[model samples]
Target: SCSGRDSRCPPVCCMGLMCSRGKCVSIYGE
Candidate 1:
């Protein structure tokens, strides 16, 4: 499942987050 700071390909991030460097990251800087 997709979650914050989790590894994900094709970039799948959780709510209020975004995909970066093959992982989920905060959109507002974290």
Candidate 2:
């Protein structure tokens, strides 16, 4: 259960995707 700052992603997802605000992202960088 992902909540607050104690979230955990399962380790069975072969593939997946993520995004923020409205843009796709792999890792947050500066």
Candidate 3:
């Protein structure tokens, strides 16, 4: 499944999270 990084995070990140380096991080700007 997609997660952590872009390659894994799929097209985008999960709710309340942002795509960072390839992974999903806090929407607060990680």
User: Candidate 2's residue-wise lDDT over 1-30, tens digit each?
Assistant: 222121232331123423344333333330
Please identify which of the two predictions, 2 or 3, would achieve the higher lDDT against the true structure. 3
lDDT of 2 at 3: 22
TM-score (C-alpha) between model 3 and the true structure: 0.39
On residues 1-30, what C-alpha lDDT tens digit does candidate 1 reach at each position? 566565473346777676676777777885
Off by over 4 Å in 1: 9-11
lDDT tens digits by residue: candidate 3, 6-26: 433535666656666566776
- Show where candidate 2 strays beyond 4 Å: 1-16, 27-30
TM-score per prediction, in order, is 0.48, 0.25, 0.39
Runs of candidate 3 with Cα error greater than 4 angstroms are 1-7
Q: Report the Cα lDDT for residue 22, model 2.
A: 34
Please rank every candidate by lDDT, starting with the best.
1, 3, 2
